[PDB]
């Protein structure tokens, strides 16, 4: 029975439906599940005021405001501010009840419903760990995790130290394994394997142990990219088996501990660190509290064998043949199988919803592809044409928005164009036609246009199951240029800058060179373009290799005429900035020499910034910890006070503007600064 020792079951248990149902309801110890429930509830309590935005609710959902919002379903709308505060209070109470184990099912539902409502209210805040939090709450709703270390069993003896069915652990282990394995198969991308995603991360001070035996390029290629991919692909197998459990635990602990310090991902690392003692035996808390000194063994609840439970089926050779599995056992087994299959399938469902497929497949947040793609934006231009007068105007990029994610997706762009169309008539503009011109580079590629600039977005066609037509394709057969681009960027001056641009045939780019941007030139690398100076009205054709100097404070255009896309580059210098720097340095040196034998004010304030940075570096970490604690306390106190004010308004009524202003002023006192 070697297989029966490695896997915990035998191949014959899967030969019939009844045997499978009997296996999946095997009694188990509930200690690990209770510890995980407690930790998850505590982390959600800590996370609600910080990342979910309880402290910025008044800014986000202010009454009487013109905002473009991006919900998944346009039929979903936010409530007034007071009802939003009530929703967040109910979510907080549910998380607290989940953590304490008191009224487990009601608290689970009270956390699950408003959390998912708030998640679906906004597409621009979706990430992978918020999706995981929703999934974990949904799973824990159907589990009986209040059978140990809880208030429910303290006040009710029928649910104290009882058994649990086996599929409770199976579902959670399967979820964790799915996350790990599908994160590593997503990182078998050519950008990740070749080292193009996280190229500057090895400059951190945490990687300095590895530089004692490797170069910086080798450290970036091996430790950051290949090491991360291998950990993701092997962590589940290392954790599942008992031979390699200890090494896997150490490796994943180090991985998550480093990730918690390199990035700002909320509570993701702590959630993952506390989901890894769930691959251990279900009795580990009991052994751990047994190994403690006997002095501290008389205050905890007395250790005893768990009592039988109804939810799990009992099969014994001597203790009766067994009972017929009722509806509960079959429903549990079916839920396990179907949920695991759906969670396997969903990350690879992008061929059905083609309307959400831009350069990158799908929306962001449910495919476990973290840090694989990085985006840089060069320019955004929005122009509207009046339908009554024909005049052309220009808007700021992102006037009525609160995020910047609308620049990367076509559904969000359609929503934004519609919201602008309905809002502009309030500003004495008849029915407009809106055109967008956005330049993006992904993973240090050439900059290019993501959408067609000649298409009126408000009247364009977009559907959830049809591939969008006004989305420009990514120029994939230009990536091998990145070596040359990096070499050209590296072999430059400390005062010059470069911009790399790839354009499609039949389109032109119009640029206005600023007054201070003297000594600007354009050089062609591939294809053929013609440059037109607007004032002098002189076309000029360029060939591969030559460069042309442009005037400052004037317009010019670049027309692409080759049958294939053509790439060129911009080189420019800030003559005003260099003159300012040189005169500042000269005057500072002269003054220093004279003494020892607003320009200066800017030099002195930059020096003061340097002094503050270096003195905070010299300051011990205790001051930083104190400041961090003070900021956290201020955030928590403000959230509580605003919630109290809103609840008082809802329950009693709005007293007066003067008292409301006084209370709002009180809530922003910065307790100890």
């Amino acid at each position: 029975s070697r297989i029966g020792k490695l896997l915990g079951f035998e191949w014959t248990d899967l030969s019939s439906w009844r045997r499978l149902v009997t296996l999946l309801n095997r009694p188990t110890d509930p200690a690990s599940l209770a510890v995980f429930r407690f930790l998850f509830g505590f982390l959600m309590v800590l996370d609600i005021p910080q990342e979910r935005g309880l402290s910025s609710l008044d800014r986000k959902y202010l009454d009487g405001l013109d905002v473009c919002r991006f919900p998944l379903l346009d039929a979903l709308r936010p409530l007034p501010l007071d009802w939003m505060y009530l929703v967040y209070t109910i979510m907080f109470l549910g998380a607290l009840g989940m953590m304490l184990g008191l009224c487990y099912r009601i608290s689970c539902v009270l956390f699950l419903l408003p959390y998912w409502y708030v998640f679906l209210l906004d597409k621009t805040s979706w990430n992978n760990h918020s999706y995981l939090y929703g999934l974990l709450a949904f799973q824990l709703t159907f589990m009986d995790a209040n059978h140990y270390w809880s208030v429910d069993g303290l006040l009710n003896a029928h649910r104290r130290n009882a058994h649990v069915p086996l599929w409770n652990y199976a579902v959670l282990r399967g979820q964790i394994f799915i996350v790990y394995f599908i994160a590593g198969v997503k990182k078998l991308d050519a950008d990740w394997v070749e080292g193009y995603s996280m190229e500057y991360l090895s400059r951190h001070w945490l990687f300095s142990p590895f530089k004692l035996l490797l170069s910086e390029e080798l450290t970036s290629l091996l430790v950051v990219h290949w090491g991360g991919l291998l950990l993701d692909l092997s962590a589940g197998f290392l954790l599942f088996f008992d031979v390699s459990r200890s090494i896997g635990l150490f490796f994943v602990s180090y991985f998550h501990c480093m990730n918690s310090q390199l990035f700002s991902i909320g509570m993701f690392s702590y959630v993952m660190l506390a989901s890894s003692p769930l691959f251990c035996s279900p009795e580990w808390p009991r052994k751990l509290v047994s190994y403690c000194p006997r002095r501290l063994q008389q205050l905890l609840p007395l250790k005893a064998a768990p009592q039988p439970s109804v939810s799990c089926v009992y099969k014994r050779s001597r203790g009766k043949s067994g009972q017929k599995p009722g509806l509960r056992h079959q429903l549990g087994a079916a839920f396990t199988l179907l949920y695991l299959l759906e969670q396997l399938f969903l990350p690879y469902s992008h061929f059905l919803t083609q309307g959400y497929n831009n350069w990158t497949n799908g929306l962001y947040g449910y495919s476990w592809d973290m840090m694989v793609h990085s985006r840089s934006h060069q320019h955004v231009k929005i122009t509207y044409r009046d339908g009554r007068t024909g005049e052309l105007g220009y808007l700021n990029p992102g006037v009525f928005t609160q995020s910047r994610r609308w620049k990367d997706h076509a559904d969000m762009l359609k929503q934004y164009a519609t919201c602008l169309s309905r809002l502009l008539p309030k500003y004495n503009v008849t029915e407009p036609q809106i055109y967008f011109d956005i330049w993006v580079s992904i993973n240090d590629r050439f900059q290019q246009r993501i959408f067609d600039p000649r298409v009126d977005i408000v009247q364009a066609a977009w559907s959830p199951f049809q591939r969008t037509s006004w989305v420009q394709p990514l120029l994939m057969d230009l990536s091998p240029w990145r070596a040359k681009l990096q070499e050209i960027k590296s072999s430059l001056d400390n005062h010059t800058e470069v911009v790399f641009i790839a354009d499609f045939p039949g389109l032109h780019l119009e640029n206005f060179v600023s007054e201070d941007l003297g000594n600007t030139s354009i050089q062609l690398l591939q294809g053929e373009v013609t440059v037109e100076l607007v004032a002098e009205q002189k076309n000029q054709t360029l060939r591969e290799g030559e460069k042309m100097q442009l005037p400052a404070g004037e317009y010019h255009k670049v027309y692409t005429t080759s049958p294939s896309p053509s790439c060129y580059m911009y080189v420019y210098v800030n003559t005003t900035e260099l003159a300012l720097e040189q005169d500042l340095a000269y005057l500072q040196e002269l003054k220093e020499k004279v003494e020892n034998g607003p320009l200066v004010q800017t030099f002195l304030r930059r020096q003061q910034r340097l002094q503050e940075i270096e003195r905070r570096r010299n300051t011990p970490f205790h001051e930083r910890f104190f400041r961090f604690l003070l900021r956290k306390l201020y955030v928590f106190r403000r959230s509580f006070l605003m919630t109290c004010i809103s609840l008082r308004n809802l329950i009693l009524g709005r007293p007066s503007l003067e008292q409301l202003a006084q209370e709002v002023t009180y809530a922003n006192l910065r307790p100890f600064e």
Binding site: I265, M370, M371, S374, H377, L395, V499, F512, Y570
Partner: peptide
């Protein structure tokens, strides 16, 4: 305060991961 001109709208010459909060 929601309108550019044409000398600040045409100046082309003047890093992002979605996991970060």
């Amino acid at each position: 305060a929601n309108f550019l001109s044409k000398q600040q709208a045409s100046q082309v010459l003047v890093n992002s991961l979605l996991e970060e909060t």
